[PDB]
Structures are given as C-alpha cells and as structure tokens.
Amino acid sequence: TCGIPEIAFATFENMEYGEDHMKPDTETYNWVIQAYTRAESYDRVQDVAELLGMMVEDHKRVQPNVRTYALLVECFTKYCVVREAIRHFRGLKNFEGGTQVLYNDGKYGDPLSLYLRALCREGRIVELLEALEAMAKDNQPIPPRAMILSRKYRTLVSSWIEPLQEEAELGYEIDYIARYVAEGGLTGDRKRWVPRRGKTPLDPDAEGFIYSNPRETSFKQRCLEEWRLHHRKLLKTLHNEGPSILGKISESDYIRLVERLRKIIKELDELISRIKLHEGNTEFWKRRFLGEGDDDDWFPLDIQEAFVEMRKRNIFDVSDMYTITDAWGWTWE
Amino acid sequence: GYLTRRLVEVVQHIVVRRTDCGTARGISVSPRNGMMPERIFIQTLIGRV
Amino acid sequence: KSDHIRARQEVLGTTIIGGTIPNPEDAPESFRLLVRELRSLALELNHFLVSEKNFQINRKE
Amino acid sequence: MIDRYKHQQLRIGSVSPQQISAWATKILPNGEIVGEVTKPYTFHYKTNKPEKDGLFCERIFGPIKSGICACGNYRVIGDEKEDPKFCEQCGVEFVDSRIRRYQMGYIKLACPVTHVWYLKRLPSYIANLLDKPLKELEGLVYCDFSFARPITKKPTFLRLRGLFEYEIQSWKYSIPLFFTTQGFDTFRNREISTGAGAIREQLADLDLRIIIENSLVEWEELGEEGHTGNEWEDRKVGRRKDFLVRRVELAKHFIRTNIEPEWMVLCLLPVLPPELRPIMSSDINELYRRVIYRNNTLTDLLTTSRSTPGELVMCQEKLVQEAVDTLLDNGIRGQPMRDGHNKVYKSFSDVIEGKEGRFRETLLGKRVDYSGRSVIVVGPSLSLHRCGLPREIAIELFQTFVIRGLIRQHLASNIGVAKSKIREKEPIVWEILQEVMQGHPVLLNRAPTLHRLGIQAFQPVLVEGRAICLHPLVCKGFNADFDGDQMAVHVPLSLEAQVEARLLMFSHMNLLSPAIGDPISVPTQDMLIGLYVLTSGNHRGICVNRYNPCNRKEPFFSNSYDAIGAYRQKRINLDSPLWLRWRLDQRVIASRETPIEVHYESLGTFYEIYGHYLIVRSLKKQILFIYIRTTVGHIALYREIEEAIQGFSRAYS
Amino acid sequence: GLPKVEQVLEVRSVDSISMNLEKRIEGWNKCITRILGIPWGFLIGAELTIAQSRISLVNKIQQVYRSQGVQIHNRHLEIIVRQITSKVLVSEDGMSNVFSPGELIGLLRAERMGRALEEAICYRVVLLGITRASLNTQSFISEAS
DNA sequence: TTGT
DNA sequence: ACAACTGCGATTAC
RNA sequence: GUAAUCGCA
Numbered sequence A: 001t002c003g004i005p006e007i008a009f010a011t012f013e014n015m016e017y018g019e020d021h022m023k024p025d026t027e028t029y030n031w032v033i034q035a036y037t038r039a040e041s042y043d044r045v046q047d048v049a050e051l052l053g054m055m056v057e058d059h060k061r062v063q064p065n066v067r068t069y070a071l072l073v074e075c076f077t078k079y080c081v082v083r084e085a086i087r088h089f090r091g092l093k094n095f096e097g098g099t100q101v102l103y104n105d106g107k108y109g110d111p112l113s114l115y116l117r118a119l120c121r122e123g124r125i126v127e128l129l130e131a132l133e134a135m136a137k138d139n140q141p142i143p144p145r146a147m148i149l150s151r152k153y154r155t156l157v158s159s160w161i162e163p164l165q166e167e168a169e170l171g172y173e174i175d176y177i178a179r180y181v182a183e184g185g186l187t188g189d190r191k192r193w194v195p196r197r198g199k200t201p202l203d204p205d206a207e208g209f210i211y212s213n214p215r216e217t218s219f220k221q222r223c224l225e226e227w228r229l230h231h232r233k234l235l236k237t238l239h240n241e242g243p244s245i246l247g248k249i250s251e252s253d254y255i256r257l258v259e260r261l262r263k264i265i266k267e268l269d270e271l272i273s274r275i276k277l278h279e280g281n282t283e284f285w286k287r288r289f290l291g292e293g294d295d296d297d298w299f300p301l302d303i304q305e306a307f308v309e310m311r312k313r314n315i316f317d318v319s320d321m322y323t324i325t326d327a328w329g330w331t332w333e
Numbered sequence B: 001g002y003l004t005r006r007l008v009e010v011v012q013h014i015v016v017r018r019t020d021c022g023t024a025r026g027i028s029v030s031p032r033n034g035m036m037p038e039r040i041f042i043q044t045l046i047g048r049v
Numbered sequence C: 001k002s003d004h005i006r007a008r009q010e011v012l013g014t015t016i017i018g019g020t021i022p023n024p025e026d027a028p029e030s031f032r033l034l035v036r037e038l039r040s041l042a043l044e045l046n047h048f049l050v051s052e053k054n055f056q057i058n059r060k061e
Numbered sequence D: 001m002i003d004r005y006k007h008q009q010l011r012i013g014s015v016s017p018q019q020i021s022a023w024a025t026k027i028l029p030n031g032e033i034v035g036e037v038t039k040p041y042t043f044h045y046k047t048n049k050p051e052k053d054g055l056f057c058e059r060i061f062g063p064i065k066s067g068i069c070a071c072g073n074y075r076v077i078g079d080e081k082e083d084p085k086f087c088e089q090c091g092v093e094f095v096d097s098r099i100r101r102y103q104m105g106y107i108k109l110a111c112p113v114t115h116v117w118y119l120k121r122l123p124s125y126i127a128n129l130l131d132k133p134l135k136e137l138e139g140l141v142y143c144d145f146s147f148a149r150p151i152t153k154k155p156t157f158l159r160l161r162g163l164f165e166y167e168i169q170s171w172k173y174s175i176p177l178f179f180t181t182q183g184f185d186t187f188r189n190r191e192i193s194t195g196a197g198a199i200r201e202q203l204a205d206l207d208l209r210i211i212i213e214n215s216l217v218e219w220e221e222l223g224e225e226g227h228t229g230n231e232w233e234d235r236k237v238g239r240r241k242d243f244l245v246r247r248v249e250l251a252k253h254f255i256r257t258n259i260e261p262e263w264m265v266l267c268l269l270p271v272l273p274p275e276l277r278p279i280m281s282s283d284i285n286e287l288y289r290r291v292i293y294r295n296n297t298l299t300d301l302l303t304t305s306r307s308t309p310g311e312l313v314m315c316q317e318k319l320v321q322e323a324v325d326t327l328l329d330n331g332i333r334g335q336p337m338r339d340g341h342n343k344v345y346k347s348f349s350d351v352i353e354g355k356e357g358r359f360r361e362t363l364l365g366k367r368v369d370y371s372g373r374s375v376i377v378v379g380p381s382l383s384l385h386r387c388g389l390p391r392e393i394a395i396e397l398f399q400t401f402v403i404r405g406l407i408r409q410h411l412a413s414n415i416g417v418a419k420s421k422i423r424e425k426e427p428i429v430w431e432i433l434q435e436v437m438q439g440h441p442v443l444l445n446r447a448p449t450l451h452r453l454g455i456q457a458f459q460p461v462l463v464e465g466r467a468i469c470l471h472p473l474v475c476k477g478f479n480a481d482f483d484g485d486q487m488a489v490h491v492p493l494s495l496e497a498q499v500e501a502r503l504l505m506f507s508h509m510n511l512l513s514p515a516i517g518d519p520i521s522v523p524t525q526d527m528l529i530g531l532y533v534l535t536s537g538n539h540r541g542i543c544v545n546r547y548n549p550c551n552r553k554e555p556f557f558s559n560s561y562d563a564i565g566a567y568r569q570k571r572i573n574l575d576s577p578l579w580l581r582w583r584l585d586q587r588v589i590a591s592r593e594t595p596i597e598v599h600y601e602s603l604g605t606f607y608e609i610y611g612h613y614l615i616v617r618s619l620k621k622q623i624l625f626i627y628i629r630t631t632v633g634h635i636a637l638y639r640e641i642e643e644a645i646q647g648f649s650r651a652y653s
Numbered sequence E: 001g002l003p004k005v006e007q008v009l010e011v012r013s014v015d016s017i018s019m020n021l022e023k024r025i026e027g028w029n030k031c032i033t034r035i036l037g038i039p040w041g042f043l044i045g046a047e048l049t050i051a052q053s054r055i056s057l058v059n060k061i062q063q064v065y066r067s068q069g070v071q072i073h074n075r076h077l078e079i080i081v082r083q084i085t086s087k088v089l090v091s092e093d094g095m096s097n098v099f100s101p102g103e104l105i106g107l108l109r110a111e112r113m114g115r116a117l118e119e120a121i122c123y124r125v126v127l128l129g130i131t132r133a134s135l136n137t138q139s140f141i142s143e144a145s
Numbered sequence F: 001t002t003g004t
Numbered sequence G: 001a002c003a004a005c006t007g008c009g010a011t012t013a014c
Numbered sequence H: 001g002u003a004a005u006c007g008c009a
Ligand SMILES: [Mg+2]
Pocket: D480, D481, D482, D483, D484, D485, H009
C-alpha cells in the first residue's frame, strides 16, 4: 500500500531466492501483483506478466485463489489486455463471491465496472453476458459507472449495435434543453465537452484506465474480425503443415482452398473443415517434440536430431512443456 | 586497453548476492563431444559445483 | 581526499584531535557540478533516497 | 535472513520554465525579484568589480567575498546581535561565498528557442511526435516560412490548412486592415504562425491518445502486402512502420511520466553558476554574452514599435536561436562557428561528452590528497609485508600525524611551533614519525593497473634515500622492473580503511592470480638460477671419471648439519657426492627401478643398492639403515624448507 | 589473435563468428516455425540458439587464447557471454499492449511471458555485441553514459 | 585513416 | 552521426 | 587555466 512497486519486489526476491522456509506463497504473489497493478508512476505491465510467469510452479503448492484472479483481471483490464482478462475471469467465475472480490468496495475505480466497460467497448458482448450472469449468480449489483456518452442513448446494453455514436430515431424529438436541465441546468454542474491543453481525458469513460478507453468496435466488426483471424490461422497451418492433409483431392482442391482463403481473409467446405488447428494442445506439441509424429561441438542440422541431442544433454525436456492452462488446471478452455 | 575497458562495463553490475538461487538445471560436460582433450576436460570440471 | 570540502576541512581537525573520522553522507563537489551543468542543460537530477522504515522520500541537496 | 534494504533512485527529466525560474528567483527584503540576467557585462572597466545585473552580478547570484558585500560594510553571519540578511542599499546578501558555486541564473527570451538535442539529432523526437517531416521543421525554425494552422483546439476562421507556407505572398494586408489591427494581432496566433510559436502550439495542443490511436490504425493498415513488393517499397513500408512504433512509444511514455512535450521548446534559458565558469575568460561566457546581446537587441526591436519590419526581427530571432544552439550543442548541425582565431567554440555537450568530458575526467577518475610518487628500487631484504619508504615522502604523507604527536608529547605547544620544528628537521621529529607509522598501512600502486594486483598494501619502513624499495617476489604482480618505473603511495585515514588495507589488500593474502588460480609470486630470475644450481646434480658418467671404474661417494654424514658444516668449511664441494643417513622415511622421489645389485651374506643381512640410495636390511625383514646419495644442495633446500615450516610453527606458540 | 578476440565479442556478424553457426541458426529459424506450433517453437528455438551460440562463442575464444599459450578459465568467459546472449528481439509482426515490435527483453522474462500470455509473442534471439549491450542497460548513468 |  | 591505452613529467605560447 | 611539442615507463 506504499505506492512504490520496487520495495515489495525486493522482499519478493529475498523470499524467492532464499531458503525453503522463507519461500513465497500464494499470498506473497498476490501482494506483489497488487503492488505492481495499482502503481501510479510508470507502465508496470510486463512486470506483472513476468511475475505471473514466475508464479508458474505447479508442484510447489503455488495455486491461484480468488484474489489472484481478481487482481489479474483488474491489471489486464486497466491495460486493455482483454483476452487474458477474460481468461482469468472465467477462472474467477468458479469461486463463490469472486465478482464481489473483484469489486473491491469501489475504492480503486470499480475494476469489475472497468472490465464490463472494456467488454462493451470492443464488442465482445457474449463474454459481457457471461459476466452479467456471474454477477447475478453472486448477487452483485451493477456499479454506478453506467456512464452515458455525449448521446444519452449509450449504455452497456446497446452501445455495440451497428449505429455507433449515433442516436436512434424516436417518435418525439430530442429535447436537448430538457436534457440540459436534467443533467443540471444553471446549477453550474454539467460536463462540458471542450478539449483542454492539459493531459486529462475530457471523456469520463477513460477514467480508470492507464492510457485510454478501449477502442470502439461493433459486434459485427468483432465477429468478422475473429472470422478472418480463424481463417488466417487455418491458412497458416495449411502453409506450414505442407500439402499433406486429410483431403485426398490435391490438385484442384489446393488451388480452390488457397484462393477462397485469400478472398476470405481480405461445396468443398468439408476440405476446409478437415484442416484442424491444434493450439494449446500440450500433448500434441510434446508428441511432435518427441518425434512420434569444423571438428567442434556442433548440433546436427536436422530438427528431430537436434531434439534428441537436447534431450540427451538435458537442455530441454517434455516435462518442462507446460503453461497456465495445465498448471492452474483450467479445464474449460 | 580498449578491449579491457569495454568488457568491464558490460559485466560491471554482477556481484554474488545469494547463496543459492534454486536452479535445477546444469550443463552436461562430456569429453567425446569435443574430441576429448584430457587437460581441457580437467580444466573445465575443476572449480564447478 | 579529493573533493569533499567540508569533510576535508573536518579531516585535519579530527586527525589533530585524534577522533574517528565519520563517513561522509553528502554528495561530492563533482556530482553537484554535474547537477548544475545538466540543469543548465535543462536536465534535472535528484538523489531521492527512500526510507525502508516509513516509506518516505527524502531529497539530498 | 532479511537483508538490509537500501533504496536510492536518481531521476532525470525535462524541467519546466517555472522550475528553472525558481532555481534563480529570490525575494529580497525590499520586495524585488532577483535572478534575471539582462546585461552582457561581466566585470567593471579597470575596477575588477562585478557589474550589476550582469553575468557575474552580486545581487542575483551572491557576494564575491565571505562576510563582505558590494556596499562596503562587512558583516558577520550568525552573530548574536540582530543583523539584516541583505543590505538595503546593496542586494548582495551577507553569506559565505560558496553560493556563487551553486547558484544559478536564467535569461528571459522574447522569442522561444528549440532544443538542439531534440530537433537536430538524426532521431528527432519533435519530428516523431509531430508527424510533419524533419526538413519542414528545420525550415520553419531556421528559414523564414509559415505554418498555416498551429492550434487545433481553438476556432479558426481562415481555411488555409497547409503544412509549409513557403512565402507570405498570400493576401494579408487587406485582411489586417479589414479586422481591427488589435483584433488581427489577437487571432494571428490561431492563424498562420512563424518561427517558434507554431512548434510550441503543436506540442501544447495535442492529444496523445488520438496520436496512438491513429498510429495503431496506420500500423494495422500497412503490412498487408508490402513485403510482396520490391525491396525499395518493402524498405519504405518498414521504415514507416518503425516510425509509427517509435511515435506510439513516445506518446505512451509521455502519457504517464508527468513530463510535457511543451518543455522541449525552451521559453527561458538557465545560466550556470558564476564560479563554475570563472573569468582567463571562458567560451561558455563568450557564448552567454553573445546570446544576451542578441536577446536584448531582439527585445529592443520588439518593444520599439509594432510597425517594425518583420525581416529584421526575424533575422534577429534566427541569430538568437543559432546562438542558443551554439551554446547548448555545437557540431550537430555541421557548422563549426569558429572564434576570431578560427577556433571552434566548446559547448555543454562537448563538456559532458568525451574522454576529457565531465564524466570520465572528473566523476570516474580523480586525484587525491596524501599522495606521492617516486622511482622504485629493489630491496632484497624486506619481507612481503614490508616496503622501503623514503623519509622525505613519509614526513609529507604523515605530517598531520606527527603534528598530533608533537602536540601530545611535551615537544610542541601549538600547531605552528610543531610545523616549524618539522620544517627544521629536528631529530625527535623522525622518531615521532617512526613511532607513528609502525602500525599504519601504505597503499602502493602503478600507472598500468591492468589486473587487480596493481594496487597492494605493505608496511612502510623508514629509509634514508629517495627511492621506494620494493620486495623482489612481488614484482611480477606489478609488472615492475627497476629500469625507471615509478609508483604512487596512499595513506588510509579512516579506521575502516586501515582495517581493509591491513586484512584484505596485503600480499600474503593474495598469492594466486585471479585468472586460473596459479602462484603469481615465485622465484623468477636470480633465485631460480640459484635453486637450479643447488638442485642440478653432479657429473655422473664419463665426466666424473676418465677410465671405467670396473678395473677398480666417499663422504658419509650422519646428519645434514654435519654435511652443511663441511660445505661451509670447504671440505666438500657443492656438487660433490656424499651419503646421508635417513631415519626411515623413504620420501625421495625416484624412478621405478629395481636394485642394480643386491649383496646377500650367509648370516642373513642383505644389502640392496639402488640408483640413489642404499637400504640395508636383516633376516627379519627389518630395515636397519637407509643412506641417501645426494649433494649438499638438495639437503640444503630440504632443510631450509623444513626449518621455515618448523620456525613458523614454533613462533606461532 | 587479439583482433579476432575483439571480433567475436562484438558480434558484428554471425558469419564472421562461424559459417556453420549462421547456417544452423538460420535453419532453426526457418524450420522451427513448422513443428511444435506457436507456443513451444519460439522457446525451444531460443534455447537451442542460446546453447549453440554460447558453446561456439566460448570454444572460439578459448582456442584463440590457447593457441598462444594463454591459459584462462572458462568461467570468466562465461559471465561475459551470458550478457551477450541474454536478450531477445521481438519480431515486427506482434504488437500488443504488453510489448511493441522491435523491443529488447530478457530471455527468461520472454519465456515467462510466453508461458503466461496467450497473446502471440514472436521473439528471436539477437546476439548483442559488447558495446550494444552496454548501451542497453537498466542504468542510464553507468553504462549508457 | 578505419570501421561502425 | 559515433569511438579508437593508461598515466606521469618538462618546455613555450596564449 | 588551456593548447602545442617532446620525453617517460
Ligand atoms: Mg620498465
């Protein structure tokens, strides 16, 4: 709670490289993550990532708790890292009261509200619905940061529709004077949208984030972008996996698939479905590394021979192949 | 003189500040890998933990 | 022995009397010069030592 | 094992004009503000007195003498009687004149200037933040041009919206007359600006979030198919992408560093403390006088009349900016701007950067008090911990200690009498000097200090000469030969330094080189020759005898002491062979050779003759006698080593 | 001799240090993208390149020193070498809020971030010459100045 | 100059 | 654009 | 206080 993320890191390094009795625990990692997350001086985002990588010790009783997931979600939200934030929020959902812990009494900008706003702005509304369901399950009311934009239509409910930053047509005309007296008329208390020279965001939604609010992207744009990314990684797998594929028709189907993929990224659908993208499958990568699928010290130029040479010299082994998915045991992914 | 100066700068910071860091990995020294010089193997092994 | 004017002044007295010479805590004149030069170049430099006991920042001038 | 936590964090950054003003601004008792430098004068004419409101002014910086002032009345600071801190008549305060060393100043600039480091370096931070090209900014700074829209946060009636206006030929006289002239002046800043206002308005009126957003968008757009193109197009795309990434990084750092890009253009210029640029006169001060003169001429032209021609004030602005550039960093633009003697002017960048710069010459290397150098000679009867030191050096190094000794004993009343007695070379002074340094360590060192053994510690022994004696075995470490080499001497004052010198830096604690851990102190030239002569051997075969002994050594000594005494008495030569009886040790290194001849008698005693020893035994397999065949040299070496070990062990008790 | 010593330490080019080393390094850089996928290809390639470069960088310097009869222990050469081969260069393809293209991070830090973050971090081993390394340090007053 |  | 041994001592010229 | 020039090891 000092505000300097380097005084706690010294104690963390004293614990980590000390004896066994003074080795760190889950509470220590949580405290250092809280210290680095709530800094006010510099970026401190790669520090949290390196600390999380150091936190990967499965058979050392170092397992995450509710506070770990809450702090990781808060950190990745404040720095617009939405994917890992959702990854850790999926784990936080399993604990009871985890959303209440994420809403740390609203003292630090309502990190749950910041998470909801980050989900709303980019357009990942299915994860927003999941978060709302989790909040309803944990009996957590919506934080009061349901901020309206310059157009009072904006809310977490419908700011992701195709018409963005534009108000829909209604039977009655928009009464801007009524709104004026509603926000506060001549009571000298209104948000005047005028740019200022100082380094202060005029938009009130940017408050709470280290740099800025996540960029505004609609749900349809996010869907088409993820579709293009899926097809692009499929084409990448086809490229770096050779012509050999489950499909037996090589000549015409290769050209058809490559041209259709080039068109998509910028009825033979079974051929594209045959290509499987193996991402995050540690077993497949371990089986591939195991090979199942002058006059100085030099390693053999072949890849599998280099692998067996490393395994003989103990440089790297299949036991060292692990990630958080496996370590923290998140099965759902 | 020039070579002695630059080297010091790059590695100036390093200082022994811990008794053990906890690493479980170590390099494998084998004679037949590098034509097996006996004197070089002895010089390599001597002084290490 | 080189640059610390006050310490050097005190060294002769402490040696003549025979007392122990305390360890200097102030910055030498060479560092102070640098600060002055760099601040003539519109660049700041502050020591800013932080106490581990009470987490307070103290500037050394 | 909780460690002792020491937290020290040096911080550097760009300073606002408010801070560089507060570094100099001071409020006198009358109520005036001092700190502004406004006159190029440094000193009075043929009076050698600091000129008022000048580069060396007493009022803004401080008094030139301790307790004295420019008004002419001396005062004592800290006296019991109430004394005014500063004279009413003269601004100079009554303080010790150390402030002139640490006190800064500042010159107010009518036209802003741009920092050379940010602008004219190949990576231009200003050109990075303002996407405008570097050539456009360098022109707008140095070559009279115009920027149409420098402000983006205020209303703009004119719709020029241009980057570089190469000429003012656009209709502006009809525009100024139409509007009220005062009104035209009011909005011209939002209108086309020139020289140094457009850059400041662009840096000030800027949204870093919009900048990073647009740069991320342009980065996402580029790179789709640029690599497929030619090497030239791919190179252009790559360079643009790198520029965009650098812009993103600069803006992201500016967001969360409590530093503003507005401070890159200098509104006010700080002035170094006077003592640091003492006038003999320095270029620093020559450039300071030049920029002061140009700035006051510019201020005069501005305050004279608004109807003044723009060409003159613009040229004087360019001259002021060039003077500021030459003061800050000269040589980046490529123009030397030599002096009257065709010699380049030095700048602050030249002061800090370089081998002879501030850092390497002062901070990382410096000379000390209590030091002396002299030539070195061999002292062959010294021990590894003792070194010969001349007396004329020791008296100067340990002068304060011998003064304290003369004061303590009833030999000197005061420091002056003691110094006079030391200068008179009285005999008691040398006795006190000897008694002083009996337990004090001396740090010797050499100029080519390549390894860590260049600096060691010894015990100084008073000698009568001018040459520092050194132990022979310690020469290898210092790479020292007595062909003219010289060495330095250092005296540790503090008790901690004395303990460190006596424990760590001594020779007996450093006998192995830190490269491979090999003995560094070994017999080298003459001792090696002596040892080789001792242990060489004797003529064994045809050299010792002219005829074969078949047709046909002698001395037998029970103790090594007897053989050494016989050698001292010239009874036996150094290489003369002899037999020495040993007391059942068999420690002689020899070849794995069987006995050359074995004599076995009836009674049971068999004599076994070996190459270098005779071993008589009896029927009971009992070793009766052992006689080693050697020379006085080997037994002398063995005895001297054994007696050294035994004498060490006995002296320990 | 000594010019050859300066050359290896300031790694101006990997072809200078060895042709077989450059060949193997480019072969790994090309092939390792195919097998082992995204998360376990960069890490293993970095480890293999670190091992081969360290072994090579040492063997060369030790042979150059021993050809003249200078006997030095490999530990001193190792400390320096580690610094040369301790940083990694992020590729231009990957840009995120955590890291930017063209940045220089540490090998252990890069591996720990790759293990934790699903976001694809494309990093390749840049052997840094003594001088470059100094110019890139945590202290701006000691090694940068 | 020599090379970076 | 940048850097290329370490220091010391003597003189004369500004 | 800075240069130039030579020497030193
Ligand atoms: Mg010599």
